[PDB]
Amino acid sequence: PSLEDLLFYTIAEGQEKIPVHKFITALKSTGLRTSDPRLKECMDMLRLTLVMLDKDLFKKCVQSNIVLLTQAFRRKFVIPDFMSFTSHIDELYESAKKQSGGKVADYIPPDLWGVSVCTADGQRHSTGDTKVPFCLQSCVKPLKYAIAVNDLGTEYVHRYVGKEPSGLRFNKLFLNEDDKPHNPMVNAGAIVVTSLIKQGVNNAEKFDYVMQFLNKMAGNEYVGFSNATFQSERESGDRNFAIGYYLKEKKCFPEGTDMVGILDFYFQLCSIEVTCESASVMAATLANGGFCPITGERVLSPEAVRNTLSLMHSCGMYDFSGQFAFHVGLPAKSGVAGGILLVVPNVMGMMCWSPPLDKMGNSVKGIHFCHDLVSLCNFHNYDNLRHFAKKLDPRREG
Amino acid sequence: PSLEDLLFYTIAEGQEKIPVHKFITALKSTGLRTSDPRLKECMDMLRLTLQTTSDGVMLDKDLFKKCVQSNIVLLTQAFRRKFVIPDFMSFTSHIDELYESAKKQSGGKVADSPDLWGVSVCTADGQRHSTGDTKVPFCLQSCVKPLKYAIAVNDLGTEYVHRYVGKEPSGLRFNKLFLNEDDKPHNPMVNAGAIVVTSLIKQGVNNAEKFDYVMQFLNKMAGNEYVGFSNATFQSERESGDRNFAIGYYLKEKKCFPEGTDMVGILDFYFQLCSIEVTCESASVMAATLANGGFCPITGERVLSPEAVRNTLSLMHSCGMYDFSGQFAFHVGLPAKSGVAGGILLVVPNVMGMMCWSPPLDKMGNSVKGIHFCHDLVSLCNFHNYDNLRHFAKKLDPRREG
Amino acid sequence: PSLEDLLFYTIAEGQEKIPVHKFITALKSTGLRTSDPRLKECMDMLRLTVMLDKDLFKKCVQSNIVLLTQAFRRKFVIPDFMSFTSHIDELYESAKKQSGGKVADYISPDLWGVSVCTADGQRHSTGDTKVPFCLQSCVKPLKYAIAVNDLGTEYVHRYVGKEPSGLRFNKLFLNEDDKPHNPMVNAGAIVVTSLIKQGVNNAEKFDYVMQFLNKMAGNEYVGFSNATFQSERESGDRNFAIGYYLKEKKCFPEGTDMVGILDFYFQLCSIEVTCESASVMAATLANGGFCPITGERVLSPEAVRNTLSLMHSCGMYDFSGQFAFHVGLPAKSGVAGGILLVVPNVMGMMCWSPPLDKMGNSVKGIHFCHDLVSLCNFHNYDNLRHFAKKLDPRREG
Amino acid sequence: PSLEDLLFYTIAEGQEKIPVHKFITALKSTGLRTSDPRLKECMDMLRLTLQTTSDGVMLDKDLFKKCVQSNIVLLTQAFRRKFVIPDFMSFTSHIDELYESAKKQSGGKVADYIPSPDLWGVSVCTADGQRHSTGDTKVPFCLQSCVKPLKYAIAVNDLGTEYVHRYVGKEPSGLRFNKLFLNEDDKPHNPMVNAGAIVVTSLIKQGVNNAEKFDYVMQFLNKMAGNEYVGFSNATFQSERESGDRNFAIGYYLKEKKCFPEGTDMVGILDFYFQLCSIEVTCESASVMAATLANGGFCPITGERVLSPEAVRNTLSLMHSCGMYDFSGQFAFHVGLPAKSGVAGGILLVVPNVMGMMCWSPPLDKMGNSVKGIHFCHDLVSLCNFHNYDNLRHFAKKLDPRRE
Numbered sequence A: 001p002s003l004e005d006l007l008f009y010t011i012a013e014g015q016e017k018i019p020v021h022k023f024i025t026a027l028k029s030t031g032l033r034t035s036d037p038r039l040k041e042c043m044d045m046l047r048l049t050l051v052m053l054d055k056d057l058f059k060k061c062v063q064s065n066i067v068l069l070t071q072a073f074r075r076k077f078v079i080p081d082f083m084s085f086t087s088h089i090d091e092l093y094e095s096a097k098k099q100s101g102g103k104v105a106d107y108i109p110p111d112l113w114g115v116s117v118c119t120a121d122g123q124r125h126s127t128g129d130t131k132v133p134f135c136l137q138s139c140v141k142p143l144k145y146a147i148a149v150n151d152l153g154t155e156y157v158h159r160y161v162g163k164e165p166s167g168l169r170f171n172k173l174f175l176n177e178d179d180k181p182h183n184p185m186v187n188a189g190a191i192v193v194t195s196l197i198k199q200g201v202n203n204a205e206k207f208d209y210v211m212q213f214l215n216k217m218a219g220n221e222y223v224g225f226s227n228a229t230f231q232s233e234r235e236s237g238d239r240n241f242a243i244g245y246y247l248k249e250k251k252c253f254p255e256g257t258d259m260v261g262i263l264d265f266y267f268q269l270c271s272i273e274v275t276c277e278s279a280s281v282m283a284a285t286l287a288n289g290g291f292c293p294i295t296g297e298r299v300l301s302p303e304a305v306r307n308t309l310s311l312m313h314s315c316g317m318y319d320f321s322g323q324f325a326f327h328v329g330l331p332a333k334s335g336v337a338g339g340i341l342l343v344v345p346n347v348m349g350m351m352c353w354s355p356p357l358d359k360m361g362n363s364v365k366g367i368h369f370c371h372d373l374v375s376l377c378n379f380h381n382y383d384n385l386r387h388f389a390k391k392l393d394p395r396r397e398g
Numbered sequence B: 001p002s003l004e005d006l007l008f009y010t011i012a013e014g015q016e017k018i019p020v021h022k023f024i025t026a027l028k029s030t031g032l033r034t035s036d037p038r039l040k041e042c043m044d045m046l047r048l049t050l051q052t053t054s055d056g057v058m059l060d061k062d063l064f065k066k067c068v069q070s071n072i073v074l075l076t077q078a079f080r081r082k083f084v085i086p087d088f089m090s091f092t093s094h095i096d097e098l099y100e101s102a103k104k105q106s107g108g109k110v111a112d113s114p115d116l117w118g119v120s121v122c123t124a125d126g127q128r129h130s131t132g133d134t135k136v137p138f139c140l141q142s143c144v145k146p147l148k149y150a151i152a153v154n155d156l157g158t159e160y161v162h163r164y165v166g167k168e169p170s171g172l173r174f175n176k177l178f179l180n181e182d183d184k185p186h187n188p189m190v191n192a193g194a195i196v197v198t199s200l201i202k203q204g205v206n207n208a209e210k211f212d213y214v215m216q217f218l219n220k221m222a223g224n225e226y227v228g229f230s231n232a233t234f235q236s237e238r239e240s241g242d243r244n245f246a247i248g249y250y251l252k253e254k255k256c257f258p259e260g261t262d263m264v265g266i267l268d269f270y271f272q273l274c275s276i277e278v279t280c281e282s283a284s285v286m287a288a289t290l291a292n293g294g295f296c297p298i299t300g301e302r303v304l305s306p307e308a309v310r311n312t313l314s315l316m317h318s319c320g321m322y323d324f325s326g327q328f329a330f331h332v333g334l335p336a337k338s339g340v341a342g343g344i345l346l347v348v349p350n351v352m353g354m355m356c357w358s359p360p361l362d363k364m365g366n367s368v369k370g371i372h373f374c375h376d377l378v379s380l381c382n383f384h385n386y387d388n389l390r391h392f393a394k395k396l397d398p399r400r401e402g
Numbered sequence C: 001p002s003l004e005d006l007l008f009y010t011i012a013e014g015q016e017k018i019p020v021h022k023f024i025t026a027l028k029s030t031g032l033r034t035s036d037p038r039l040k041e042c043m044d045m046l047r048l049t050v051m052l053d054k055d056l057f058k059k060c061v062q063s064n065i066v067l068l069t070q071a072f073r074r075k076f077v078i079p080d081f082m083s084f085t086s087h088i089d090e091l092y093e094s095a096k097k098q099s100g101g102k103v104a105d106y107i108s109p110d111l112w113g114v115s116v117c118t119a120d121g122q123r124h125s126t127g128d129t130k131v132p133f134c135l136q137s138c139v140k141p142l143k144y145a146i147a148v149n150d151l152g153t154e155y156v157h158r159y160v161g162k163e164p165s166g167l168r169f170n171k172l173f174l175n176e177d178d179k180p181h182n183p184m185v186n187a188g189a190i191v192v193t194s195l196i197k198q199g200v201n202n203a204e205k206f207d208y209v210m211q212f213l214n215k216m217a218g219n220e221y222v223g224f225s226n227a228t229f230q231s232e233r234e235s236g237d238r239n240f241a242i243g244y245y246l247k248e249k250k251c252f253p254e255g256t257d258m259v260g261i262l263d264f265y266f267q268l269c270s271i272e273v274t275c276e277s278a279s280v281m282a283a284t285l286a287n288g289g290f291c292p293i294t295g296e297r298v299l300s301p302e303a304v305r306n307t308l309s310l311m312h313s314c315g316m317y318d319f320s321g322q323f324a325f326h327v328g329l330p331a332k333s334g335v336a337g338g339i340l341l342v343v344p345n346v347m348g349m350m351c352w353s354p355p356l357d358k359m360g361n362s363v364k365g366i367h368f369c370h371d372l373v374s375l376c377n378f379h380n381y382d383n384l385r386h387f388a389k390k391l392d393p394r395r396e397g
Numbered sequence D: 001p002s003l004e005d006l007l008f009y010t011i012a013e014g015q016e017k018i019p020v021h022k023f024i025t026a027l028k029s030t031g032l033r034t035s036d037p038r039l040k041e042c043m044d045m046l047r048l049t050l051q052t053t054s055d056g057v058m059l060d061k062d063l064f065k066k067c068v069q070s071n072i073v074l075l076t077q078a079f080r081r082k083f084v085i086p087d088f089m090s091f092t093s094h095i096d097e098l099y100e101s102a103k104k105q106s107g108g109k110v111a112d113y114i115p116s117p118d119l120w121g122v123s124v125c126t127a128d129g130q131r132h133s134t135g136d137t138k139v140p141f142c143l144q145s146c147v148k149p150l151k152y153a154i155a156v157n158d159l160g161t162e163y164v165h166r167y168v169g170k171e172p173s174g175l176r177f178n179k180l181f182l183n184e185d186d187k188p189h190n191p192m193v194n195a196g197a198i199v200v201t202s203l204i205k206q207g208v209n210n211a212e213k214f215d216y217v218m219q220f221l222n223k224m225a226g227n228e229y230v231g232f233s234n235a236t237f238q239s240e241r242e243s244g245d246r247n248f249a250i251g252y253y254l255k256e257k258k259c260f261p262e263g264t265d266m267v268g269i270l271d272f273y274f275q276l277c278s279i280e281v282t283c284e285s286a287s288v289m290a291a292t293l294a295n296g297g298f299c300p301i302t303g304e305r306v307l308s309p310e311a312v313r314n315t316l317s318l319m320h321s322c323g324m325y326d327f328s329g330q331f332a333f334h335v336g337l338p339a340k341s342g343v344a345g346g347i348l349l350v351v352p353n354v355m356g357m358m359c360w361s362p363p364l365d366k367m368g369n370s371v372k373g374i375h376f377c378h379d380l381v382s383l384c385n386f387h388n389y390d391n392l393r394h395f396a397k398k399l400d401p402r403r404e
């Protein structure tokens, strides 16, 4: 016995040869895409091969990659029937497509809508306008927070920022009662954690450090930059300057920080570009303890991915985050571009994008989707995996 | 094949009889106690079989076959380590370390002769462990606000109960307001909110009959372990409820009760509810019912709708520790509710419930030795609600093998 | 040479006989009524008696002639009194015809009345001045004045603050020192109600206030409407919340019967007045605590200062900041439609029209006090030397 | 009968000539100083007669007649005890007792964020020009926050009430919502808080550069002070450029909520604002500016009309409401006088229709007001019926220096 051989006739269907055309169709229906970084040496050893393969031919194509190839074919992934799962994701996408309401962030203008999924095991699925780039806006506030506590630790990062939400009373306060901004996912907090990344180095390269980091969160899928909104947020950041002058005056930055310099760095971070496919993977890195699901590299400390997931829950949808925490119970983060970065812990990462916002700042179709997501699957964080009434569980068989 | 015989050979050690005393000693090290309601038919058919032939007190596979035939689904999963904490007696030795951890924190002042302190656990499968002063009765005080919140949503549905009470915390600035921005109390775990949900249970009937309804409910949440009542603090808390009356009159003026509510009567019912007595063992089981989708773990009966036990666990997370709830939700992330008697009702979803009790409170109203305990609990096990079950650094996972 | 003789030829028109009827017409043009309380010995000793000579005259007015001199020497604080009333009539009628507003939940030729009584007793009314209505929280300064009159500034403010809330905070009960903000919001009024005459029963404290309001109005009309007493006992769920809140945060004097003080509070808010009556109470406040039509001392100078200071800052509920700016007069409104107005050192007034705006102020009342200071230099930070294009009725002209 | 002649015999004491030295000491005893701008033409014709015949310093009825012929309407009401404080030297000896009463109160610490023998001064100028100072009254110090009412007056004087309150409110904050910049109609609360003062700074004489409006404000302050000392201290101007991160924060917040007139350069307005905050005065100088506010906008020692009555009503009314930072509700109640303090140690005091004052001691309490200044203004209305809701008829055991 052993496993490169045993797996050969579970794909082979008893024949003595298998076309490679039925190996890839079998593998792409487990949810993996043939692009998968951890599948490289496997299909590196197959396009140089070219059409049926036999058990000698096969075995030294998959031997280095067969430990994970087995899980896809034994359906021991966290969503085993990933076919059933996507057709409900498509069904959720299409019911959100028909509620027109909202207006776009009027200082960035067929209109568009896309949602992408990437599981903690690398299973991938997109529908709609998934690789059209758009900026993160305040979607990036948890990522730069995660980076911060990854490099500095929980206690340093919260010497400078609090860890709770304000209250619908305090959408116009900057500081809490200990003279820290309330939390990392509101602008006053995001500016301060921007100040703590890679201190002592200049803003040209500490920006690059983040972009190195975002490249590791997306498994090196698309993370770009739009200079259009970088200058356009300097134009119309008179409020962000007030916060900076307020926090400078109230002694809230690490010592020797250049305040008006940090706010510039803040504006570039808010217009890093992604797509929903790219961003789904970074969401999935947060869903999986800080290990990127399509590369296997550990990107963020477990401490950082807990702290981040803890505050995207309470604070991630601006004033709608209390209603969110109640009715959907998933760590999520919205930004003004139309995106919502969604994390179902131990399952999946997601990015939904539709630019029309509501009257609180959340993608209108995005919010409808995440209600329907947890209306139908037991993904809320205070469901029980044993008794869950009339909703489905894609983590099990049929 | 068949499941009663193989279980014989899992315990029988190849020999052809088993002494009756070491079958239960095996089962008692699983974490279940021989008292388990779902084991009663098994031990009925075992100690009157103990005196059928009152010596030769060993069983053969036949006799065994129809002493465990009653509950052989649960008997196998106890002996095959398929409970959600399989090595339950390594786990307790860490619970014991955490008990003794907090035992040496002098601090606190009690709400107006040794140190009282106790913590009990009941897992989602019925496994139990207690340490310290676990069977001494004490009142729930605002520990009961989640339980009665669940009852409200169980009988009425989420959408009705929240026409009358909000679903978010106030803010650590507004710990002095009664109403939010929609003229509802902020949420079920503040007196103003709990008073209003008290008004929603069993409308149209008299207050004696709704009080019996709640306890009738609390008894099935606790698998019918101790649910009592202390009339001493009911009159002592009817004494000093001017603030709550202030809350009551404000809410009447702002039309915040259902139509036809007798407001001044509702407050008396509220003081009654706040001095229902429990122990750490009893409450331990109701926490575990919340830990288990609304099924009582030591009886198997359905107590609360999944809708209700989600809403409850979700607001015990946000709002459950008075002013310390954001700091709690961040550093331990477990649904909890403390009350002024010294209890903390703790839920690890899909694992266990707990009740820790030590009457000395800190300066926010939370049990001093309890808070120290629940920090170290998730400091030590990956039970935080946003840990990962795959990568979690130097922490232990009592849910798995080696 | 004595002053009854001196006053005699000033009236007599050179003749050596004077008709009695041209004397009262002369006296009514100074502003005083013939009913003036410190004028009665004069009008008693001529009502039993139609021309009179100098010995006839002398021994009817020696009685009161120190006060009669100033009416005829035009040394009253408003000397040309009918240029003055003639503008009050113009002010009264400009407010007439602004229909807007709605009445509270109390019980059809729609009513409006304003009366004035100067620091010298000169009086004038127009409209529905002799119809009774309740003070409501118009009474909050009067019971405050009583409290501080009997207890002193420092005791009374061990229990209540001395500033307005914030333009924001009419939905809080206490300030940051755990006192209600000030005596002219319900929470503050309840607690100063708690301080009147403590240790006695509530039937007797209510009589004590009524003894006192009888002295503030020179014994003019102060009655009571039990209809509105019952409606605030009925519809005071609000006030009970305040009482339990204040009882719970230790804000009453010791041995206070909380639920009893609130009933007493509801009684005080349903004391009836008219505009004429209340004009006098306003004028007592305008006059250093001396009732202008009796000469009796009613409130301590300390009390009438403290009171006048907070009707300025706090007297129109949420409109008191704008009020202090645009009219600058101590004033107090209540939900019945009244505004008790004080021009210090000049006059008191009471304006009453039941349609309110939606901050709680008589709509026609507020319009009137805008036009009043929009016309005379009665604002508290006008100058008595250069005052642009408006009137000063304190001089000749 | 002649209007110079009857006055001739009130001083001449029956004698037939008057020495120059007891006409002058008589006039100093009214409260006027002989420097008075509207009396200089009078002393022009006496300092020339002291040299025409070098000895025999005495005047005759005709010589006297046309030395005072010039200003005889004010000279008569000065010698006739027709000033609003007729016994001016009992009044000052009470001011001296109040000054000396406040001087032995140790408390306070100076704002030595911008720094031997304790400084303390108080000066008075009545609505009639009667003058009095004691202590450190001729030492320059900046207005700082004292200037917020004066430039507020200028704004509504040049623009009218409703325009100026198109951009700034007219009530106090409230001590719960005092750490906010805006109210509920998105205007700063009122002209006497930095947020409000910045906005009113933005409205003065727009369209011109900031140097020329600074010259305009100082032209204006000189006519409020009767052309006594109005200076500038560049040292604390630099100390306010360096410690203005809060004010820039205020500036950016207000720029984002559209709170300036259109075409305002916010960052320039902040610099103009810091300039205004370190205009220097002394207690004597500032005394006169207060007295202009006490007198319907007429400068009491020059007789010129400086501010519209509309402007000085509005100003006087908000110095009552808002002028003492967090202590203004307590102030308005216990002294009830329009006032403004600033962090330099000054309190600008107005008793309407009587006098203005400036008290200066740099040690502040823990709300920002002169310790010895506040002590002085309590004792002032403790002793005189100057509170704004006393009565001029019955006022218990208080003094009235306005009457005989």
Ligand SMILES: Nc1nnc(OC2CCN(c3nnc(N)s3)CC2)s1
Binding pocket: B176, B177, B178, B179, B180, B181, B250, C171, C172, C173, C174, C175, C176, C245
């Ligand atoms: N939404 C709401 N509006 N108004 C409310 O009043 C409640 C009762 C009195 N309160 C206080 N008064 N004074 C203090 N120091 S707290 C505030 C809570 S809750």
Ligand SMILES: Nc1nnc(OC2CCN(c3nnc(N)s3)CC2)s1
Binding pocket: A172, A173, A174, A175, A176, A177, A246, D179, D180, D181, D182, D183, D184, D253
């Ligand atoms: N209408 C409005 N007025 N003020 C607003 O917020 C401004 C900026 C931040 N502020 C804080 N003060 N104190 C804190 N801990 S944050 C208050 C000023 S909005």
